[PDB]
Ligand binder design. Structure first.
Ligand code: ATP
Length: 570
């Protein structure tokens, strides 16, 4: 649109005449100039508005400098869905019968623009179109939703704090951000407190049952039941799940941006089982996408997913989900593009009344450090094909040097990706503790040493992050692979220590003739095998992990001699 307004139609005649554009444009027409929206809107007709001026309105309220037609379509579709929920609620009639809820609808549209800023506004030289992430989940995500079945709403992701001029402003939790001055009138605030709206709630100090009730209301689930409670449900995860649900229930394609460390599959499975509750039908459908996947199997799997989608919907009245993990490593990433962006599989249209939501993932596009590139090229014999002559690149850089071998994400997906988070390590250690308490089975193993195990796991993870390069971003993937290693080492830690003492007695002096913990030595083995085995700067790791170790192995020499002794034992 930005490059047609000057020289000149532009809008689709059948789409302007559609409600998905007429309703947002009608509301924007009434709101651009200042009129009370108490009048009855959405006549189920076509207003005397022009497609050109409609495009002008959506441009001046889209904010981003150079929007494609896809981004305008996303904005308008999202805004239409949200205003449809607003009209479906009895709050317009609530204001009519209250006669003092004035200023409610201007706040409604302003907050709509805010959450649209959230949703339909994203944004090395060749990685610049991809790695340049202006907004992360470490940003304000003000969210409001209208719960269909009942008459209670949910205001998540922000706070309402009394302003100095008598008003109430949007203050984000855990810090001070004073965005959106003068958004509402105090009569709306009074009517809201008359309506007992759950506004300005810090969800970090609310019970699991109550937060699940808040979700089920927000997720529109009636008679909620709690399917899983072994996963911590923080505020940011709530923001993510509501973001996904809004995205795929309004119509926006939902591509997921994040690294392997972040928990994405777990969260979507959580959402799917919350939607399902107790039916035995297969709702979530994981698809493992990898660097040998060709379009035939993706097309076939999507077809079978839509088949099982009819199966679920027609005779269960349920909504299912199909998921793709790291759906970027395939040379057929664009196949995922036509699957999800324009709703067409292998040239065949995907039915909106079938009942199915497609969610795909993506890896972050970032080049390795030159230090580990030297490490790789020096791994004995160098690579067969050098970088200048590698055919499978994305730009001027081979996939061999990237942190994930990921091909160029096609356009019309860049305006769609949105990051889940970097796993800031504030909740990393808690998840590690949960894993090490769930899968170690330490009912009677070590009442307090489990804290030490989790802490040294987090310390090693921080060592991995506190270094310019990493193997493959094995964050929260090597820990859930090494808890099992630790459990195995403890399970056989009985004859191992006996053989250790025998070997050290029959082949060494009295220095290695001391008792060792069945756990701490097992911890030394787990760190030696999962983490200390791979990296080539082992001295630094030995000196930077000896801190979290207790008295027997306070230094690097102790850890090294223990690992070497066990290798010699085997
Ligand atoms: N002039 C227009 N007026 C209204 N909507 C438009 C206009 N042009 C495009 N759109 C909207 O843009 C959306 C995306 O466009 P479309 O799928 O044709 O993109 P594309 O350029 O073919 O995609 P890609 O290059 O990613 O394959 C369509 O669903 C359509 O509704």
């Amino acid at each position: 649109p930005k490059e047609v307004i000057d020289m000149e139609p532009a809008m689709d005649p059948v789409e302007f005449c559609s409600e998905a554009f007429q309703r947002p444009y009608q509301y924007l027409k009434r709101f651009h100039q200042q009129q009370n929206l108490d009048t009855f809107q959405y006549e189920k007709g076509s207003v005397e508005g022009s497609p050109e001026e409609c495009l002008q309105h959506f441009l001046i309220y889209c904010g981003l400098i150079n929007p494609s037609w896809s981004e305008l379509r996303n904005f308008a579709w999202f805004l239409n869905c949200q205003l449809k929920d607003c009209e479906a609620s009895i709050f317009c009639k609530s204001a009519f019968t209250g006669d003092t809820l004035r200023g409610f609808k201007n706040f409604v549209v302003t907050f709509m623009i805010l959450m649209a800023r959230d949703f339909a506004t994203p944004t090395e030289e060749d990685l610049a179109p991809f790695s340049l992430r202006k907004r992360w989940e470490s940003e304000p995500h003000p969210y409001v939703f209208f719960n269909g079945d009942h008459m209670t709403m949910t205001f998540i992701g922000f706070h309402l704090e009394t302003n100095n001029n008598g008003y109430v402003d949007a203050i984000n939790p855990s810090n001070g951000k004073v965005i959106k001055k003068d958004v509402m009138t105090k009569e709306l605030f009074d009517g809201l407190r008359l309506q007992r709206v759950p506004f300005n709630i810090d969800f970090d100090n609310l019970p699991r049952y109550e937060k699940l009730e808040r979700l089920c209301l927000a997720l529109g689930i009636e008679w909620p039941i709690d399917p899983d409670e072994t996963y911590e449900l923080t505020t940011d995860n709530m923001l993510k799940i509501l973001a996904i649900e809004m995205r795929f229930r309004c119509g926006i394609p939902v591509i997921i941006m994040g690294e392997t460390g972040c928990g994405k599959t777990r969260l979507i499975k959580f959402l799917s089982d919350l939607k399902r509750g107790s039916v035995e039908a297969e709702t979530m459908k994981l698809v493992k996408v990898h660097g040998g996947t060709t379009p035939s199997m993706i097309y076939s799997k999507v077809k079978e997913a839509e088949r099982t989608a009819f199966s679920n919907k027609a005779q269960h009245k349920l909504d299912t989900i199909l998921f793709f993990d790291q759906a970027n490593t395939t040379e057929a990433v664009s196949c995922i593009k036509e699957i999800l962006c324009d709703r067409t599989v292998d040239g065949e249209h995907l039915h909106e009344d079938s009942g199915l939501h497609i969610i795909a993932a993506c890896n972050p596009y970032r080049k390795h450090s030159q230090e580990m590139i030297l490490r790789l090229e020096s791994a004995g014999l160098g690579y067969r094909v050098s970088a200048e002559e590698t055919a499978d690149r994305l730009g001027s850089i081979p996939l061999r040097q990237l942190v994930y071998r990921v091909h160029a994400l096609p356009p019309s997906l860049i305006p769609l990706v949105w990051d889940f988070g970097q796993l800031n390590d504030s909740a990393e250690k808690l998840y590690i503790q949960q894993i090490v308490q769930r899968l170690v089975d330490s009912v009677s193993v070590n009442p307090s040493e489990t804290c030490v195990i989790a802490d040294v796991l987090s310390a090693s993870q921080m060592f991995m992050r506190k270094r310019e390069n990493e193997c493959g971003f094995v964050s929260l993937r090597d820990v859930e692979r090494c808890v099992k290693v630790f459990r195995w080492f403890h399970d056989h830690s009985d004859m191992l220590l006996k053989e250790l003492d025998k070997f050290l007695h029959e082949s060494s002096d009295s220095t290695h003739t001391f008792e060792r913990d069945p756990v701490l030595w097992s911890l030394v083995m787990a760190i030696g095998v999962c983490y200390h085995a791979s990296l080539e700067e082992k001295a630094s790791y030995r000196t930077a992990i000896a801190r979290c170790f207790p008295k027997p192995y306070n230094s690097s020499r102790a850890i090294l001699d223990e690992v070497t002794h066990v290798q010699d034992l085997f």
